[PDB]
Amino acid sequence: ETLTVHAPSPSTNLPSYGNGAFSLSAPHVPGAGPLLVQVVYSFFQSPNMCLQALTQLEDYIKKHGASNPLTLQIISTNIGYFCNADRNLVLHPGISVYDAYHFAKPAPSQYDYRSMNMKQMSGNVTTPIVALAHYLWGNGAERSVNIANIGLKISPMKINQIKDIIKSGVVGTFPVSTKFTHATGDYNVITGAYLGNITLKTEGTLTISANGSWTYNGVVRSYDDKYDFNASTHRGIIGESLTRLGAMFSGKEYQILLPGEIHIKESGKR
C-alpha cells in the first residue's frame, strides 16, 4: 500500500534537499533579474515556501515515482530540512524561516528525525511539512503547536460576538464566552494545512458603542485539546499536498495539541 519514507537520518538523508538537483527557493520571476536573498528570504517566510517544498516533493514523485528510492530519500531529506528548520524556529522563535532553514546549525541534511524530532512545531510556514514529517515518522506521537504560533486571525464577526454586534445592536460591554469553529485554512494555508478547522474557545469582553463600533477583548484558546493530523483535517492547498503525500506514504495519524491562549484585541464597526 503506502510507501515508507525513511525517517530523516544522517544515514539515509541525501546530502541535500532535492538531492541538490532542486532547492527550495523563491520563484524564478522572469525579467526580475538575479534572485536576491531578500526575495528568497521573504519567500521562506511565506507559506509559499511550504507549498513549494511540498510541490517539489509532489513534482519529484510525479517525475520519479513515489516508490523510487531516490524519491523516498528526497522526501525524507527534504522534509528533514523542514523539520530541521522548524526545530530551529521552535528553538529560536522569532527568527525568520529563511534563517532557521538555512543556518542550520545542525546541517539540515544531517537531520535525524528519531533524535531530533520535536513534539512542538513552530506553527511557522515550515510546520505543515514538519506535520507531515510527524505523520511519516512520528509513530503517532502527539505534537503541539502553540495556539499563539498558528497565526490565528480571529474575526469576532464570525463568532457569537457577531450576534452581540450584528444587529442585536446592543450597546455596552458584554461577556463573551463561546466556542467557534475556526477554519484556519480559510486564511492561513499553513495552519490550515495541518490544523485546518479548529475549534476555539474565546472568553472576553465585547464592547459595542452605539455607533456600531465594537472591540472584542478576549482570550482565544483551542476548544479542542488537540487536532488530528490526517487527510480529513488538512485544509487548504498545502493541506491538500499533505493529503496527497500522506496518501502515498506510510505514516501514522497523530494529534496536534493546540495549547496556549492568545489574547486578542479585535475591533470593528457594525
PDB file of C-alpha atoms in Angstrom:
ATOM      1  CA  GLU A   1       0.000   0.000   0.000  1.00  0.00           C
ATOM      2  CA  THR A   2       1.543   3.260   1.150  1.00  0.00           C
ATOM      3  CA  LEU A   3       5.294   3.584   0.807  1.00  0.00           C
ATOM      4  CA  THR A   4       7.571   4.029   3.736  1.00  0.00           C
ATOM      5  CA  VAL A   5       9.691   7.074   3.681  1.00  0.00           C
ATOM      6  CA  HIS A   6      12.680   6.582   5.856  1.00  0.00           C
ATOM      7  CA  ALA A   7      12.834   8.958   8.774  1.00  0.00           C
ATOM      8  CA  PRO A   8      15.399  11.584   8.057  1.00  0.00           C
ATOM      9  CA  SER A   9      18.624  10.392   9.484  1.00  0.00           C
ATOM     10  CA  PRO A  10      22.189  11.238   8.628  1.00  0.00           C
ATOM     11  CA  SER A  11      22.479   7.638   7.386  1.00  0.00           C
ATOM     12  CA  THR A  12      19.647   7.922   4.892  1.00  0.00           C
ATOM     13  CA  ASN A  13      19.431  11.568   4.182  1.00  0.00           C
ATOM     14  CA  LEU A  14      20.640  12.882   0.975  1.00  0.00           C
ATOM     15  CA  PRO A  15      23.489  15.385   1.262  1.00  0.00           C
ATOM     16  CA  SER A  16      20.988  17.902   0.078  1.00  0.00           C
ATOM     17  CA  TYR A  17      17.444  18.945  -0.161  1.00  0.00           C
ATOM     18  CA  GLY A  18      16.255  17.855  -3.591  1.00  0.00           C
ATOM     19  CA  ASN A  19      19.447  15.824  -3.842  1.00  0.00           C
ATOM     20  CA  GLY A  20      20.920  19.161  -4.862  1.00  0.00           C
ATOM     21  CA  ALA A  21      19.006  18.986  -8.141  1.00  0.00           C
ATOM     22  CA  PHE A  22      16.379  21.275  -6.775  1.00  0.00           C
ATOM     23  CA  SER A  23      16.269  23.654  -3.923  1.00  0.00           C
ATOM     24  CA  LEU A  24      13.619  25.418  -2.018  1.00  0.00           C
ATOM     25  CA  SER A  25      13.890  28.970  -3.165  1.00  0.00           C
ATOM     26  CA  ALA A  26      11.803  31.832  -4.388  1.00  0.00           C
ATOM     27  CA  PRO A  27      10.022  31.574  -7.726  1.00  0.00           C
ATOM     28  CA  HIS A  28      12.001  32.480 -10.772  1.00  0.00           C
ATOM     29  CA  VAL A  29      10.478  35.819 -11.648  1.00  0.00           C
ATOM     30  CA  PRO A  30      11.428  36.259 -15.281  1.00  0.00           C
ATOM     31  CA  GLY A  31      12.783  39.715 -16.022  1.00  0.00           C
ATOM     32  CA  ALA A  32      13.245  40.356 -12.296  1.00  0.00           C
ATOM     33  CA  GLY A  33      16.971  39.727 -12.771  1.00  0.00           C
ATOM     34  CA  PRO A  34      19.104  37.666 -10.392  1.00  0.00           C
ATOM     35  CA  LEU A  35      17.396  36.081  -7.436  1.00  0.00           C
ATOM     36  CA  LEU A  36      18.404  38.097  -4.436  1.00  0.00           C
ATOM     37  CA  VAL A  37      18.308  36.921  -0.898  1.00  0.00           C
ATOM     38  CA  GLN A  38      15.613  39.393   0.055  1.00  0.00           C
ATOM     39  CA  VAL A  39      13.198  37.701  -2.293  1.00  0.00           C
ATOM     40  CA  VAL A  40      14.280  34.307  -1.158  1.00  0.00           C
ATOM     41  CA  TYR A  41      14.234  35.387   2.448  1.00  0.00           C
ATOM     42  CA  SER A  42      10.707  36.735   2.077  1.00  0.00           C
ATOM     43  CA  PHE A  43       9.782  33.646   0.168  1.00  0.00           C
ATOM     44  CA  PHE A  44      10.965  31.448   3.028  1.00  0.00           C
ATOM     45  CA  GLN A  45       8.858  33.490   5.338  1.00  0.00           C
ATOM     46  CA  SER A  46       5.907  32.911   3.079  1.00  0.00           C
ATOM     47  CA  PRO A  47       3.538  29.970   3.043  1.00  0.00           C
ATOM     48  CA  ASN A  48       4.657  29.618  -0.496  1.00  0.00           C
ATOM     49  CA  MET A  49       7.923  28.118   0.637  1.00  0.00           C
ATOM     50  CA  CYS A  50       5.999  25.359   2.233  1.00  0.00           C
ATOM     51  CA  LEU A  51       3.764  24.920  -0.773  1.00  0.00           C
ATOM     52  CA  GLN A  52       6.824  24.937  -2.954  1.00  0.00           C
ATOM     53  CA  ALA A  53       8.661  22.320  -0.957  1.00  0.00           C
ATOM     54  CA  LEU A  54       5.621  20.069  -0.996  1.00  0.00           C
ATOM     55  CA  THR A  55       5.018  20.893  -4.639  1.00  0.00           C
ATOM     56  CA  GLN A  56       8.574  19.880  -5.258  1.00  0.00           C
ATOM     57  CA  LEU A  57       8.066  16.619  -3.452  1.00  0.00           C
ATOM     58  CA  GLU A  58       4.909  16.047  -5.399  1.00  0.00           C
ATOM     59  CA  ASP A  59       6.627  17.008  -8.608  1.00  0.00           C
ATOM     60  CA  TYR A  60       9.561  14.810  -7.812  1.00  0.00           C
ATOM     61  CA  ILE A  61       7.194  11.949  -7.080  1.00  0.00           C
ATOM     62  CA  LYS A  62       5.310  12.632 -10.276  1.00  0.00           C
ATOM     63  CA  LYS A  63       8.521  12.529 -12.284  1.00  0.00           C
ATOM     64  CA  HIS A  64      10.327   9.757 -10.457  1.00  0.00           C
ATOM     65  CA  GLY A  65       7.698   7.730  -8.727  1.00  0.00           C
ATOM     66  CA  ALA A  66       6.658   7.645  -5.151  1.00  0.00           C
ATOM     67  CA  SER A  67       8.291   4.255  -4.628  1.00  0.00           C
ATOM     68  CA  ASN A  68      11.504   5.422  -6.265  1.00  0.00           C
ATOM     69  CA  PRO A  69      14.218   5.053  -3.599  1.00  0.00           C
ATOM     70  CA  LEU A  70      15.578   8.476  -4.528  1.00  0.00           C
ATOM     71  CA  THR A  71      12.101   9.971  -4.276  1.00  0.00           C
ATOM     72  CA  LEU A  72      11.815   8.466  -0.854  1.00  0.00           C
ATOM     73  CA  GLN A  73      15.240   9.819   0.053  1.00  0.00           C
ATOM     74  CA  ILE A  74      14.271  13.206  -1.326  1.00  0.00           C
ATOM     75  CA  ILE A  75      11.050  13.234   0.608  1.00  0.00           C
ATOM     76  CA  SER A  76      12.858  12.171   3.747  1.00  0.00           C
ATOM     77  CA  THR A  77      15.679  14.557   3.174  1.00  0.00           C
ATOM     78  CA  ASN A  78      13.578  17.491   2.091  1.00  0.00           C
ATOM     79  CA  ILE A  79      11.173  17.040   4.897  1.00  0.00           C
ATOM     80  CA  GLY A  80      14.214  16.763   7.212  1.00  0.00           C
ATOM     81  CA  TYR A  81      15.068  20.226   6.013  1.00  0.00           C
ATOM     82  CA  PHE A  82      11.719  21.395   7.208  1.00  0.00           C
ATOM     83  CA  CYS A  83      11.999  19.516  10.418  1.00  0.00           C
ATOM     84  CA  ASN A  84      15.392  20.989  10.891  1.00  0.00           C
ATOM     85  CA  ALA A  85      14.180  24.437  10.070  1.00  0.00           C
ATOM     86  CA  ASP A  86      11.138  24.076  12.200  1.00  0.00           C
ATOM     87  CA  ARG A  87      13.267  22.821  15.042  1.00  0.00           C
ATOM     88  CA  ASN A  88      15.355  25.915  14.729  1.00  0.00           C
ATOM     89  CA  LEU A  89      12.228  28.055  14.639  1.00  0.00           C
ATOM     90  CA  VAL A  90      10.846  26.352  17.684  1.00  0.00           C
ATOM     91  CA  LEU A  91      14.142  26.699  19.489  1.00  0.00           C
ATOM     92  CA  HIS A  92      14.603  30.250  18.364  1.00  0.00           C
ATOM     93  CA  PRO A  93      11.217  31.748  17.964  1.00  0.00           C
ATOM     94  CA  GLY A  94      11.192  34.940  16.057  1.00  0.00           C
ATOM     95  CA  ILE A  95      13.920  34.013  13.665  1.00  0.00           C
ATOM     96  CA  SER A  96      12.970  34.082  10.086  1.00  0.00           C
ATOM     97  CA  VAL A  97      12.223  30.884   8.385  1.00  0.00           C
ATOM     98  CA  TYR A  98      14.964  31.675   5.961  1.00  0.00           C
ATOM     99  CA  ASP A  99      17.405  31.748   8.811  1.00  0.00           C
ATOM    100  CA  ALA A 100      16.121  28.742  10.652  1.00  0.00           C
ATOM    101  CA  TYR A 101      16.071  26.947   7.400  1.00  0.00           C
ATOM    102  CA  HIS A 102      19.454  27.842   6.042  1.00  0.00           C
ATOM    103  CA  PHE A 103      21.637  28.155   9.129  1.00  0.00           C
ATOM    104  CA  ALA A 104      21.064  25.368  10.488  1.00  0.00           C
ATOM    105  CA  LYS A 105      23.272  24.510  12.539  1.00  0.00           C
ATOM    106  CA  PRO A 106      22.805  21.475  12.710  1.00  0.00           C
ATOM    107  CA  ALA A 107      23.025  20.763   8.991  1.00  0.00           C
ATOM    108  CA  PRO A 108      19.517  20.064   7.657  1.00  0.00           C
ATOM    109  CA  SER A 109      20.900  17.181   5.628  1.00  0.00           C
ATOM    110  CA  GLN A 110      22.084  15.712   8.942  1.00  0.00           C
ATOM    111  CA  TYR A 111      18.600  15.984  10.247  1.00  0.00           C
ATOM    112  CA  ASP A 112      17.829  12.966  12.293  1.00  0.00           C
ATOM    113  CA  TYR A 113      14.176  12.655  12.914  1.00  0.00           C
ATOM    114  CA  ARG A 114      14.384   9.998  15.591  1.00  0.00           C
ATOM    115  CA  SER A 115      16.795  12.016  17.684  1.00  0.00           C
ATOM    116  CA  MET A 116      15.686  15.430  16.710  1.00  0.00           C
ATOM    117  CA  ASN A 117      12.033  15.389  16.092  1.00  0.00           C
ATOM    118  CA  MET A 118      10.247  17.745  18.320  1.00  0.00           C
ATOM    119  CA  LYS A 119       6.792  17.419  19.711  1.00  0.00           C
ATOM    120  CA  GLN A 120       6.335  21.108  19.201  1.00  0.00           C
ATOM    121  CA  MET A 121       6.041  22.597  15.818  1.00  0.00           C
ATOM    122  CA  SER A 122       6.773  26.198  15.223  1.00  0.00           C
ATOM    123  CA  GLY A 123       3.476  26.941  13.583  1.00  0.00           C
ATOM    124  CA  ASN A 124       5.608  28.675  11.069  1.00  0.00           C
ATOM    125  CA  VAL A 125       5.444  28.009   7.364  1.00  0.00           C
ATOM    126  CA  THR A 126       7.688  25.022   7.824  1.00  0.00           C
ATOM    127  CA  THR A 127       5.158  23.461  10.083  1.00  0.00           C
ATOM    128  CA  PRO A 128       2.914  21.687   7.624  1.00  0.00           C
ATOM    129  CA  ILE A 129       5.835  19.744   6.260  1.00  0.00           C
ATOM    130  CA  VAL A 130       7.035  19.036   9.763  1.00  0.00           C
ATOM    131  CA  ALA A 131       3.461  17.929  10.480  1.00  0.00           C
ATOM    132  CA  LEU A 132       3.768  15.610   7.560  1.00  0.00           C
ATOM    133  CA  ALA A 133       7.155  14.553   8.870  1.00  0.00           C
ATOM    134  CA  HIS A 134       5.414  13.595  12.031  1.00  0.00           C
ATOM    135  CA  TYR A 135       2.792  11.701  10.121  1.00  0.00           C
ATOM    136  CA  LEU A 136       5.538   9.812   8.373  1.00  0.00           C
ATOM    137  CA  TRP A 137       7.915   9.216  11.206  1.00  0.00           C
ATOM    138  CA  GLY A 138       6.227  10.405  14.331  1.00  0.00           C
ATOM    139  CA  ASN A 139       4.831   6.992  15.099  1.00  0.00           C
ATOM    140  CA  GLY A 140       1.614   8.717  16.123  1.00  0.00           C
ATOM    141  CA  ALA A 141       3.273  10.819  18.781  1.00  0.00           C
ATOM    142  CA  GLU A 142       1.324  13.809  19.782  1.00  0.00           C
ATOM    143  CA  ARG A 143       2.651  17.044  18.547  1.00  0.00           C
ATOM    144  CA  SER A 144       1.752  20.515  19.522  1.00  0.00           C
ATOM    145  CA  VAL A 145       1.824  23.878  18.150  1.00  0.00           C
ATOM    146  CA  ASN A 146       1.141  26.666  20.465  1.00  0.00           C
ATOM    147  CA  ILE A 147      -2.016  28.438  19.515  1.00  0.00           C
ATOM    148  CA  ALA A 148      -0.014  31.637  19.622  1.00  0.00           C
ATOM    149  CA  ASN A 149       2.041  30.272  16.753  1.00  0.00           C
ATOM    150  CA  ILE A 150      -0.607  29.281  14.314  1.00  0.00           C
ATOM    151  CA  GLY A 151      -1.218  32.764  13.024  1.00  0.00           C
ATOM    152  CA  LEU A 152      -4.820  32.852  14.091  1.00  0.00           C
ATOM    153  CA  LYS A 153      -6.801  35.641  12.585  1.00  0.00           C
ATOM    154  CA  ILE A 154      -9.866  35.844  14.680  1.00  0.00           C
ATOM    155  CA  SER A 155     -12.804  37.726  13.280  1.00  0.00           C
ATOM    156  CA  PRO A 156     -15.290  38.277  16.116  1.00  0.00           C
ATOM    157  CA  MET A 157     -17.878  38.933  13.392  1.00  0.00           C
ATOM    158  CA  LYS A 158     -17.609  35.233  12.610  1.00  0.00           C
ATOM    159  CA  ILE A 159     -18.051  34.278  16.293  1.00  0.00           C
ATOM    160  CA  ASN A 160     -21.155  34.831  18.622  1.00  0.00           C
ATOM    161  CA  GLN A 161     -19.864  38.316  19.260  1.00  0.00           C
ATOM    162  CA  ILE A 162     -21.337  38.570  15.762  1.00  0.00           C
ATOM    163  CA  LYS A 163     -24.725  38.206  17.398  1.00  0.00           C
ATOM    164  CA  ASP A 164     -23.978  40.808  20.047  1.00  0.00           C
ATOM    165  CA  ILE A 165     -22.548  43.008  17.368  1.00  0.00           C
ATOM    166  CA  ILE A 166     -24.512  42.343  14.248  1.00  0.00           C
ATOM    167  CA  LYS A 167     -27.675  43.986  14.983  1.00  0.00           C
ATOM    168  CA  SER A 168     -28.960  42.848  18.219  1.00  0.00           C
ATOM    169  CA  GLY A 169     -27.405  46.331  18.093  1.00  0.00           C
ATOM    170  CA  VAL A 170     -26.814  46.051  21.793  1.00  0.00           C
ATOM    171  CA  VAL A 171     -24.657  48.714  23.244  1.00  0.00           C
ATOM    172  CA  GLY A 172     -22.343  48.242  26.122  1.00  0.00           C
ATOM    173  CA  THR A 173     -19.890  45.694  27.381  1.00  0.00           C
ATOM    174  CA  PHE A 174     -20.694  42.068  27.088  1.00  0.00           C
ATOM    175  CA  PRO A 175     -19.027  38.961  28.334  1.00  0.00           C
ATOM    176  CA  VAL A 176     -18.264  36.631  25.547  1.00  0.00           C
ATOM    177  CA  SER A 177     -17.527  33.038  26.178  1.00  0.00           C
ATOM    178  CA  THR A 178     -18.102  30.873  23.274  1.00  0.00           C
ATOM    179  CA  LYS A 179     -16.590  28.347  21.094  1.00  0.00           C
ATOM    180  CA  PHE A 180     -16.436  28.597  17.401  1.00  0.00           C
ATOM    181  CA  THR A 181     -15.196  26.607  14.577  1.00  0.00           C
ATOM    182  CA  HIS A 182     -12.324  28.296  13.004  1.00  0.00           C
ATOM    183  CA  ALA A 183     -11.262  27.350   9.552  1.00  0.00           C
ATOM    184  CA  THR A 184      -7.617  28.318   9.780  1.00  0.00           C
ATOM    185  CA  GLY A 185      -7.358  27.090   6.185  1.00  0.00           C
ATOM    186  CA  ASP A 186      -9.670  29.908   5.181  1.00  0.00           C
ATOM    187  CA  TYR A 187      -6.868  32.409   5.628  1.00  0.00           C
ATOM    188  CA  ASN A 188      -3.895  30.502   6.782  1.00  0.00           C
ATOM    189  CA  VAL A 189      -2.659  27.969   4.314  1.00  0.00           C
ATOM    190  CA  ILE A 190      -0.004  26.903   6.768  1.00  0.00           C
ATOM    191  CA  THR A 191      -2.138  26.350   9.800  1.00  0.00           C
ATOM    192  CA  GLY A 192      -4.977  25.231   7.610  1.00  0.00           C
ATOM    193  CA  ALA A 193      -2.725  22.551   6.172  1.00  0.00           C
ATOM    194  CA  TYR A 194      -2.233  20.768   9.438  1.00  0.00           C
ATOM    195  CA  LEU A 195      -4.772  22.139  11.841  1.00  0.00           C
ATOM    196  CA  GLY A 196      -7.370  23.138   9.322  1.00  0.00           C
ATOM    197  CA  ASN A 197     -10.648  23.530  11.079  1.00  0.00           C
ATOM    198  CA  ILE A 198     -10.107  24.035  14.709  1.00  0.00           C
ATOM    199  CA  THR A 199     -12.469  24.857  17.462  1.00  0.00           C
ATOM    200  CA  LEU A 200     -11.550  27.780  19.543  1.00  0.00           C
ATOM    201  CA  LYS A 201     -12.873  28.935  22.792  1.00  0.00           C
ATOM    202  CA  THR A 202     -12.942  32.610  23.302  1.00  0.00           C
ATOM    203  CA  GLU A 203     -13.723  34.356  26.511  1.00  0.00           C
ATOM    204  CA  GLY A 204     -13.621  38.049  26.660  1.00  0.00           C
ATOM    205  CA  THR A 205     -15.412  41.287  26.575  1.00  0.00           C
ATOM    206  CA  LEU A 206     -17.219  42.616  23.593  1.00  0.00           C
ATOM    207  CA  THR A 207     -17.734  46.306  23.944  1.00  0.00           C
ATOM    208  CA  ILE A 208     -20.074  47.840  21.459  1.00  0.00           C
ATOM    209  CA  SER A 209     -20.759  51.514  21.328  1.00  0.00           C
ATOM    210  CA  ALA A 210     -23.989  52.921  19.910  1.00  0.00           C
ATOM    211  CA  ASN A 211     -22.149  53.780  16.708  1.00  0.00           C
ATOM    212  CA  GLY A 212     -21.702  50.098  15.977  1.00  0.00           C
ATOM    213  CA  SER A 213     -18.034  50.296  16.909  1.00  0.00           C
ATOM    214  CA  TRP A 214     -17.010  47.312  18.909  1.00  0.00           C
ATOM    215  CA  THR A 215     -13.953  45.910  20.467  1.00  0.00           C
ATOM    216  CA  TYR A 216     -13.605  42.366  21.389  1.00  0.00           C
ATOM    217  CA  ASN A 217     -11.000  41.871  24.042  1.00  0.00           C
ATOM    218  CA  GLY A 218     -10.581  38.269  24.772  1.00  0.00           C
ATOM    219  CA  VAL A 219      -8.543  35.212  25.053  1.00  0.00           C
ATOM    220  CA  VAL A 220      -8.638  32.556  22.475  1.00  0.00           C
ATOM    221  CA  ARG A 221      -7.536  29.084  23.131  1.00  0.00           C
ATOM    222  CA  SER A 222      -8.331  25.871  21.476  1.00  0.00           C
ATOM    223  CA  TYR A 223     -11.641  24.394  22.405  1.00  0.00           C
ATOM    224  CA  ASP A 224     -10.287  21.017  21.442  1.00  0.00           C
ATOM    225  CA  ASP A 225      -7.158  19.945  23.234  1.00  0.00           C
ATOM    226  CA  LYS A 226      -5.753  18.519  20.088  1.00  0.00           C
ATOM    227  CA  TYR A 227      -6.473  18.038  16.466  1.00  0.00           C
ATOM    228  CA  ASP A 228      -5.911  15.022  14.421  1.00  0.00           C
ATOM    229  CA  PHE A 229      -3.405  15.287  11.720  1.00  0.00           C
ATOM    230  CA  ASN A 230      -4.806  13.229   8.927  1.00  0.00           C
ATOM    231  CA  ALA A 231      -6.158  13.613   5.407  1.00  0.00           C
ATOM    232  CA  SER A 232      -9.545  14.605   6.649  1.00  0.00           C
ATOM    233  CA  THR A 233      -8.368  17.505   8.791  1.00  0.00           C
ATOM    234  CA  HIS A 234      -5.949  19.175   6.447  1.00  0.00           C
ATOM    235  CA  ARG A 235      -7.299  22.229   4.846  1.00  0.00           C
ATOM    236  CA  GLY A 236      -6.122  24.487   2.149  1.00  0.00           C
ATOM    237  CA  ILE A 237      -3.852  23.875  -0.697  1.00  0.00           C
ATOM    238  CA  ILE A 238      -0.887  22.932   1.400  1.00  0.00           C
ATOM    239  CA  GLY A 239      -3.213  20.645   3.319  1.00  0.00           C
ATOM    240  CA  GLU A 240      -4.103  19.053   0.032  1.00  0.00           C
ATOM    241  CA  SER A 241      -0.480  18.434  -0.711  1.00  0.00           C
ATOM    242  CA  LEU A 242      -0.081  16.839   2.715  1.00  0.00           C
ATOM    243  CA  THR A 243      -3.075  14.695   1.936  1.00  0.00           C
ATOM    244  CA  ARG A 244      -1.695  13.598  -1.384  1.00  0.00           C
ATOM    245  CA  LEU A 245       1.683  12.882   0.109  1.00  0.00           C
ATOM    246  CA  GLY A 246       0.124  11.353   3.184  1.00  0.00           C
ATOM    247  CA  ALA A 247      -1.935   9.134   0.902  1.00  0.00           C
ATOM    248  CA  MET A 248       1.214   7.823  -0.808  1.00  0.00           C
ATOM    249  CA  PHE A 249       3.367   7.328   2.180  1.00  0.00           C
ATOM    250  CA  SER A 250       3.123   5.382   5.329  1.00  0.00           C
ATOM    251  CA  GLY A 251       2.608   7.403   8.371  1.00  0.00           C
ATOM    252  CA  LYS A 252       0.514   7.490  11.407  1.00  0.00           C
ATOM    253  CA  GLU A 253      -2.130   9.949  12.149  1.00  0.00           C
ATOM    254  CA  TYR A 254      -1.322  11.785  15.251  1.00  0.00           C
ATOM    255  CA  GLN A 255      -2.776  14.536  17.222  1.00  0.00           C
ATOM    256  CA  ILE A 256      -1.657  18.055  17.449  1.00  0.00           C
ATOM    257  CA  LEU A 257      -2.174  19.797  20.697  1.00  0.00           C
ATOM    258  CA  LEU A 258      -3.050  23.356  20.346  1.00  0.00           C
ATOM    259  CA  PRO A 259      -2.088  24.546  23.800  1.00  0.00           C
ATOM    260  CA  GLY A 260      -1.859  28.083  24.888  1.00  0.00           C
ATOM    261  CA  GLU A 261      -4.028  31.030  24.660  1.00  0.00           C
ATOM    262  CA  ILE A 262      -3.872  34.172  22.669  1.00  0.00           C
ATOM    263  CA  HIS A 263      -5.129  37.467  23.786  1.00  0.00           C
ATOM    264  CA  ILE A 264      -6.992  39.197  21.030  1.00  0.00           C
ATOM    265  CA  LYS A 265      -7.978  42.798  20.856  1.00  0.00           C
ATOM    266  CA  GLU A 266     -10.206  42.970  17.865  1.00  0.00           C
ATOM    267  CA  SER A 267     -12.136  45.961  16.706  1.00  0.00           C
ATOM    268  CA  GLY A 268     -14.624  46.748  14.006  1.00  0.00           C
ATOM    269  CA  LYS A 269     -17.769  48.695  13.340  1.00  0.00           C
ATOM    270  CA  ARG A 270     -21.166  47.152  12.719  1.00  0.00           C
TER     271      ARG A 270
END
